[PDB]
Amino acid sequence: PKVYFESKEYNFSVEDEMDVMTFDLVSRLSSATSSQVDVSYSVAEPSVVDEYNAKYGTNYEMLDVSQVKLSSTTSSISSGKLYADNIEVELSGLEALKAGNSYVLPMRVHSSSVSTLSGTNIAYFFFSKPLKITKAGNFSNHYISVKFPVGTFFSSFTYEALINVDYFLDNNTIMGTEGVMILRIGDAGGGITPKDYLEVAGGQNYRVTKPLLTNRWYHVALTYDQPTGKTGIYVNGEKWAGSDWGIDGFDPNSDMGFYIGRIYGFKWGERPFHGKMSEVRVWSVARTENQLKQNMLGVDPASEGLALYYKLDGSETQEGGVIKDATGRINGTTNGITIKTLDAPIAIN
Template sequence: MKRVYQYAFVLLATAVAAAGCKNDEYDNRSPFDNVVYLDVAEADATQLTTFKKTLPTLERDFSVVMSYPASEDVQVTVEVEPALVADYNACNGTSWTMLDAAYYELAENTVTIPAGKTVSERLSLMLKNLDGSGNAAELPIDETYLLPVTIRSASGGVSLLGSSATAYYVVKRSSAITSAASLRDNWINFPTLDKAGPQSDLFNNLTAVTYEAIIRVDDFSKHSEISTIMGVENYLLLRIGDASFPRQQLQFDGTGDAAATPGFGKFPKKDESKLLNAGEWYHIAATYSYATREVCIYVNGKLQSRGTDLGNPASTPFNLAGRAFYDLYLQDPVKYEQYKGWGNFRQFFLGKSYDDTRQLNGDITEVRVWNVARTEQEIWENMYDVDPQTPGLIGYWKFDEGEGNVIHDWTGNGNDGVAEFDLEWPSGIEVPQLNKE
């Protein structure tokens, strides 16, 4: 019994700390009182709800949870409460306004937790008319609004669990990128690029290449010493870290065709001044051209590293798809025997290289492959969006689906990506647009 009491006390203390400005409601409560709360507010009452500007509707659902089962049905009333906006702003130093009623609808405001159960059915909060498609005016872009949803009452003498009884939806129709997929323990395959054909031909015989992606890494040390962004293992791969190389530094591995003339090798050298930070969004780009023999790495549209006189213009062009590069090893039986066991990894991936321990361990969006070496100005101007029909763009994955496991190729070439496992799509994403600040 002592251990149970201590556990309950810890839970209560945690709830009090999370309540922030409002903690007086706990003063006279036993830690064994039965309480109800919103599942979405259990960890954080603030629910970031940022979405792209073209979205007309957006649904968010939630359940009411009770700390332990009751012997009879518990009726719970949930409602939108505009009066809580002032309290939230006072506690958090914000000045957001209440979202107008024309833009939301709470389908039901009563729910039942059946006897012997602790969780209600899902309730739906619908954001609507966001693009002006209804009778309401278009919701202003890049303005932030607040929508508090709270438990008003519960039957059977059940109490409310403080701040976790309210979810504050921070609503913003954004001009920024608001969708990305998590590649933690996951990666993206490209079935059409894994075999020869007209779709994969676009990725072969390349004498110049640009890789681009927007990423956010959670933890650089979770897996091996490498966090993979995109490309082909031991051929043309953009990654972070390497053996005897800083785990948080970008590296462009342009080994190329080892059976013929090699590419530009691994670039740049280790440099502790070029480390990326965990939890930050970065636009990453890497370019190479056989004609200029120059390799460049850009971070947030600005040149980070440049190498000259690298590689050989007489080298075999890069072949990123269709296993064309693999056939080159047939020209050298020794090299063929050395590398044939790596066949399954000598493909173009996002978030994977060599084996299953080198994932990105973070979020990714706005991925592109070009058959030209983009300039710094071009990269800076188009970091967050680009016309899918721009000359030289051969693969473009915006990651704006927001759900599912298929990533559409916006070039129209049909090289869609497919996740190895079910994708996670984090909510509340808003990538800062540095070239517009």
């Protein structure tokens, strides 16, 4: 007879503010025997998690062994029984775990009495820690003026943000460089683009074919892949419109330069956005559809290619007329972005 784990997998949720939890660890025999069978446990090698992720295409992160305590390392299965006496596993440091990841603790069973069954001697305990966005930045005649590093020339690029519109005026600025490359909603004064239609404008233009609602979160993105010439506008990860351009790129600093939320001082209309924004980014690459979809709620601010990042969740420093972005690269000038607490976490469906 052999020692093994009866149930391969268990799932736990790491609730808010939870730092410590305990669970039961039990192995068993394939069939009962006439003497006590001794067992012991250990945390399995991280490569066990890599094999699992490769087999299933999952993305589990291994917990640190330093946050695992066993009531005892050893146990036993009494003569005539199948299941080992319970061991309690205590997991700590849960509050510090990064949200938006799924974690695993793989436990191996060993025996000094009998053999264990390969492929059945690891128990997998999974821990989910949900990423939520519960705060966002208010725009009601507010701007962020952004100066990119000198000689910035975006060839391929991405603008993206989570937005929630309070109301639509004729032309509502999201982000960009007016007259050059700007993402907006509407240009109804021009009698072509309805007030609630996403549009890219500047040296060249195109627009979507369905309106946005008010009081609803959307993820919105504009990409341009300069080598292929393909540009797209994406809403909630779906391509809503596309075009083909021949331009080599654009200088975001040209003219009045780059603005978020309001083209401050523009004589032909400041075109303020009225609503909230979150997770506002500019990249110096064309992000793929998959990259846009998978990262709507958060990205590492250290990411290569990320030229500007405002979470607008309260974690950015605002002082002295400046709002410092998350990359540490951009000190934007602003009239102040009040961080609002949402009624519920951001949901796009």
